[PDB]
Amino acid sequence: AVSESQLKKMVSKYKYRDLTVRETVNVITLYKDLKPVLDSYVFNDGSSRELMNLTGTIPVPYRGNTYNIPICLWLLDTYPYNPPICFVKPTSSMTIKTGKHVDANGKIYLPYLHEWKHPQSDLLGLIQVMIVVFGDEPPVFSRP
């Protein structure tokens, strides 16, 4: 379990630890389905830095059918002035259908993000928007 005090230690490496910590509270307090976890990251330079990431699932209604989408959010050490890179966990029956916002590596582009004024949409906005911008056309789906 991650405590808020500990949360500071976890994102102490970032330059905006206050807004991020405060903002995460909003995300895990309202979206408890998103849990923060500490992870080790290795850069090409060989230098290592401990970064915290949000990992879990988001229930999404679709065609009367609902799927449990597993997603991992990695924050850049310069977050939130830097956009967050997202990765969608694929499976044998779930594939990535490239389209208007999904590439082949699982990158997610969202118009609200390009017009997101800091701090208005906030991370919490990204998740409900994720629930909406993916409901319009699930970039991923289960194929028998």
Toward ligand 4N1, which CB reaches closer, 2 or 72? 72
Q: Which residue is nearest to ligand 4N1 (CB)?
A: 72
Least distance CB 72 / ligand 4N1 (angstroms) = 3
Least distance CB 63 / ligand 4N1 (angstroms) = 26
Give CA–CA dist 90/70, Å, rounded.
8
Toward ligand 4N1, which CB reaches closer, 4 or 41? 41
Least distance CB 125 / ligand 4N1 (angstroms) = 21
Q: Which chain residues interact with ligand 4N1 by CB under 6 A?
A: 39-41, 53, 55, 72
Who's near 1: CB < 8 A, 6+ residues apart? none
Toward ligand 4N1, which CB reaches closer, 91 or 93? 91
| Gap between the terminal Cα atoms of the chain | 36
Q: Can you say how many angstroms the Cα of residue 120 is from the centroid of all Cα atoms in its chain?
A: 17
Element (H, E) at 23: helix 17-30
Give CA–CA dist 123/108, Å, rounded.
14
Toward ligand 4N1, which CB reaches closer, 40 or 92? 40
